[PDB]
Every structure is written in C-alpha cells, then in structure tokens.
Amino acid sequence: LAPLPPHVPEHLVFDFDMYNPSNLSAGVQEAWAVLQESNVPDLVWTRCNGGHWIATRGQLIREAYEDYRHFSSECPFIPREAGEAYDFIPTSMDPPEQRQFRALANQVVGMPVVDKLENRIQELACSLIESLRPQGQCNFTEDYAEPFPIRIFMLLAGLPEEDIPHLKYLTDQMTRPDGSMTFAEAKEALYDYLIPIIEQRRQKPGTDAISIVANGQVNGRPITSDEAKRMCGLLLVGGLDTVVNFLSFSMEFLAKSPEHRQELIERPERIPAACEELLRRFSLVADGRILTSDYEFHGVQLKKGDQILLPQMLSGLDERENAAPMHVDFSRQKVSHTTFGHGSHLCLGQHLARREIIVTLKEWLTRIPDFSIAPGAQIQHKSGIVSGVQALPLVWDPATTKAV
Numbered sequence: 001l002a003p004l005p006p007h008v009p010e011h012l013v014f015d016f017d018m019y020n021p022s023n024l025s026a027g028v029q030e031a032w033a034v035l036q037e038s039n040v041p042d043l044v045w046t047r048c049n050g051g052h053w054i055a056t057r058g059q060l061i062r063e064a065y066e067d068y069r070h071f072s073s074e075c076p077f078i079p080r081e082a083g084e085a086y087d088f089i090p091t092s093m094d095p096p097e098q099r100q101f102r103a104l105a106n107q108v109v110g111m112p113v114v115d116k117l118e119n120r121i122q123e124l125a126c127s128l129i130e131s132l133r134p135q136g137q138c139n140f141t142e143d144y145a146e147p148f149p150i151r152i153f154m155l156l157a158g159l160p161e162e163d164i165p166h167l168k169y170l171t172d173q174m175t176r177p178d179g180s181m182t183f184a185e186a187k188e189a190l191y192d193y194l195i196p197i198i199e200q201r202r203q204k205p206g207t208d209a210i211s212i213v214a215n216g217q218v219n220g221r222p223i224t225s226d227e228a229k230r231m232c233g234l235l236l237v238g239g240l241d242t243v244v245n246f247l248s249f250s251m252e253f254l255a256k257s258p259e260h261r262q263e264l265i266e267r268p269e270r271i272p273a274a275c276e277e278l279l280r281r282f283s284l285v286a287d288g289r290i291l292t293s294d295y296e297f298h299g300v301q302l303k304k305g306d307q308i309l310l311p312q313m314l315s316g317l318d319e320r321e322n323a324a325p326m327h328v329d330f331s332r333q334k335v336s337h338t339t340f341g342h343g344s345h346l347c348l349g350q351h352l353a354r355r356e357i358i359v360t361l362k363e364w365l366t367r368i369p370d371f372s373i374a375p376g377a378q379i380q381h382k383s384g385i386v387s388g389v390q391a392l393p394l395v396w397d398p399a400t401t402k403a404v
C-alpha cells in the first residue's frame with residue numbers, strides 16, 4: 001500500500017486492487033462492482049499498485065474521457081511504470097495530434113473494411129467450430145477464442161499464416177505478463193518483429209493494413225517509420241485479448257444459462273441485440289489517464305501527475321445507467337455502456353469486434369446449440385487492464401450437433 005499523498009482525504013480511501021480484487025472467485029465484473037456499493041463515493045483513492053484515483057460511476061467515467069485537456073492519455077496504464085513506457089499510437093496520444101493518426105487507423109479497421117470482411121470472418125468461425133464439433137468438448141478460450149482474432153489480423157495485415165505462432169508468442173509476452181520481463185522489454189521484442197516488415201512495405205507497399213499505415217500521411221506530412229511501428233503494434237494487440245476474453249465471458253454465460261441459449265436458438269434475429277447486452281454485462285477493459293494539472297473534479301482535489309483509473313467496465317454496470325445491471329436481458333430498451341470506451345479514443349475496432357462476436361454466436365449456436373460447463377469445473381477469472389477467463393472447458397453431446 002503506497003503512502004497516502006497529503007492531498008488525498010481519508011474518507012476517499014478504498015484500497016481496491018485492480019489486478020487482484022477481493023472475491024474475484026465470484027466473477028470479475030462482480031468483484032469490480034463492489035466499487036458501486038452505496039457507501040462508496042463516486043471518486044475514490046486506492047493505495048494499491050502505486051496509488052491512483054478510481055472513478056466508480058458512469059457519469060464521472062464519461063466526463064473524464066471527454067476532458068482530454070485535464071485527463072491525458074500520455075500515461076494511460078496502472079502501474080505508472082507501464083503507462084510511462086507505453087507509446088502505442090493513437091492510444092498514448094492526446095487530441096489535437098491524435099485526431100489524424102486515428103483517421104489513418106480508421107482506414108484499415110473501419111466499417112467499410114468490416115462489411116467487406118464479413119464472409120471471411122464467417123468462414124474462419126465455421127472451420128474452427130467444425131473442427132471441435134464432433135469432439136464433444138473443448139477449452140473454448142484455448143481452442144476457439146485464442147486462434148480467432150489473430151487469424152483475422154493476419155488477413156487484415158497481409159501477414160503469412162506461418163507467422164501466427166511467433167506473433168502469438170510475442171503478444172502474449174506483453175499482455176499476459178508473468179513478471180519475467182518488464183512491459184518495455186516485451187514491447188521491444190514485439191517492435192523487433194514489426195520493424196523489418198514496415199521497412200519492406202515502405203520500399204515495396206501492397207494493399208494490406210501495414211502498407212496503408214506505413215505509407216500514410218498525417219498532420220501535413222508522411223508518417224515516420226517510428227510512428228507506423230507504434231500504430232501497427234496497437235492494431236495487432238488491440239483486437240486480441242479484448243476479443244478472446246470477451247468471447248469467453250459470453251460463452252461462459254451461455255453455457256450456464258440454458259434459457260438464454262434457447263432464446264437465441266429460437267430467435268436468431270435477437271443475436272445482434274444479445275451481443276450488445278453481453279457487451280454491457282461482460283464489459284472488461286479498465287485503463288485511465290494522468291492529470292495534466294491540478295484540477296477540482298466533482299468536489300475532489302486532483303493533483304498534476306496523479307493517475308486516475310476510469311474503468312470502461314463500470315459504466316454499464318452502474319445502476320444509475322441500467323436498472324438491475326447484473327441481470328442479462330436481450331430485450332433491454334436502452335443498453336447503456338462504455339465497453340468500447342468514450343471520447344476521442346472510442347474504439348476504432350468496435351465494428352470489427354461486433355461482427356466477430358455476432359458471427360461467433362450465430363455459427364456456434366447453429367452447430368452446437370446445447371453445451372454446458374464441464375461438470376466439477378469452476379471457471380477462474382483474471383483481473384487487470386483487460387479482465388478475462390483463465391480457461392473455459394465446455395462439453396456437449398455430439399449427437400445434438402449438426403455439421404452445417
């Protein structure tokens with residue numbers, strides 16, 4: 001527990017540990033939702049992980065994400081040392097500079113690119129599911145979720161299929177740290193892969209995402225090799241753990257809820273609505289910002305350089321945003337959330353992510369409608385900047401399935 005800074009009043013101290021919340025065993029969203037109990041202020045200070053603020057309610061989370069002038073993305077991660085080393089584009093950049101980098105990234109992941117990839121995502125989902133179907137079991141996280149978004153990225157980026165295991169190794173090294181290397185070290189190992197490919201595609205560009213990014217124009221001039229590297233790093237990583245972990249939460253819920261499965265089986269037109277409601281209930285990201293100056297925010301004195309965690313996960317779980325927030329209802333009229341963030345850095349991959357989710361659910365429920373958690377398995381969650389599922393053993397009777 002880091003020493004309490006003099007400017008932080010005692011009554012605001014709640015020692016929440018974002019990497020190991022108490023009662024994690026009861027579900028990660030539930031563990032974070034303790035920050036929304038009635039005796040907890042809207043803005044608290046935890047002495048864990050170096051000490052930082054946490055905004056606990058959707059209203060403050062949204063407001064801080066809007067106010068980039070006070071709440072900077074220069075140091076967006078807890079602990080401070082990771083936030084400082086992090087230089088991905090556009091996620092470590094503030095407006096106004098961020099705007100045009102964001103525009104360039106949008107060219108390679110935006111809605112028209114997604115409408116085009118639709119059928120290719122479907123063919124990949126089908127091949128994975130058909131490979132598992134007659135086995136009557138899988139670890140969903142390992143056997144479907146982990147192979148799926150990396151394969152979509154390779155297609156986007158014109159990278160060879162044979163590079164997948166190495167690239168998976170490099171990205172896992174960075175986002176699932178075991179303590180053997182600093183974030184900085186992992187980032188450099190990732191950059192070492194990207195550097196030659198960027199060099200090759202600035203000399204001989206194709207029409208893949210890396211070529212488009214590495215030869216783009218930003219803020220008047222050509223993008224540097226350095227900036228292209230920093231953007232490619234994000235385009236690769238941004239869609240991996242988020243999608244893997246989110247698909248896992250969703251499938252865990254569906255395995256545990258026969259009635260919700262049956263709803264989507266009987267009413268497949270509800271899957272897009274179901275996707276949105278699961279994005280709210282099983283929201284999973286929590287990054288934040290650093291104070292650019294002393295600032296009073298909702299009656300609380302914040303100090304220049306303080307970090308503030310602004311958990312995207314919490315907005316939609318807030319009972320002030322959605323009534324009975326832990327209840328899943330696919331017919332919810334106004335599904336409010338900030339699962340993809342808010343403000344100037346709102347997820348550029350959100351359209352791609354939704355197709356990945358919807359295609360997965362549609363294809364899985366068509367082929368393997370009836371499945372359960374393996375009996376005696378207790379699903380373990382993990383908490384951090386991207387919270388997730390450690391493993392997801394599923395079982396089914398292959399006689400209830402259909403090759404489609």
Ligand code: HEM
Pocket residue numbers: 073076089090091092098102105109234235236238239240242243246284285287288312339340341342344345346347348349350352353
């Ligand atoms: C369920 C899946 C996903 C979730 C929950 C998610 C969540 C988020 C969040 C919360 C942010 C904002 C972070 C901040 O403000 O600091 C973000 C930004 C971003 N995401 Fe996603 N994301 C997902 C999938 C993807 C995918 C598939 C891609 C494709 C590569 C992607 C690419 C990006 C990029 C490029 C940004 C930066 C936008 C900017 O800085 O202007 N995301 N995402």
Ligand SMILES: CN(C)c1cccc2c(S(=O)(=O)NCCCCCCCCNC(=O)[C@]34C[C@H]5C[C@H](C[C@H](C5)C3)C4)cccc12
Pocket residue numbers: 019049050077078079081082088091174175177178179183234237238239242285287384385386
């Ligand atoms: C004791 N001290 C001080 C410590 C020292 C060292 C490590 C510590 C750890 S730690 O070992 O768990 N390290 C935490 C750092 C992990 C960050 C990696 C994510 C980057 C990739 N993702 C994105 O860019 C994105 C950016 C954006 C938001 C989000 C989703 C998408 C989009 C991708 C993330 C925990 C606790 C304490 C530690």
Ligand SMILES: [K+]
Pocket residue numbers: 074075076083084085086087092
């Ligand atoms: K930084």
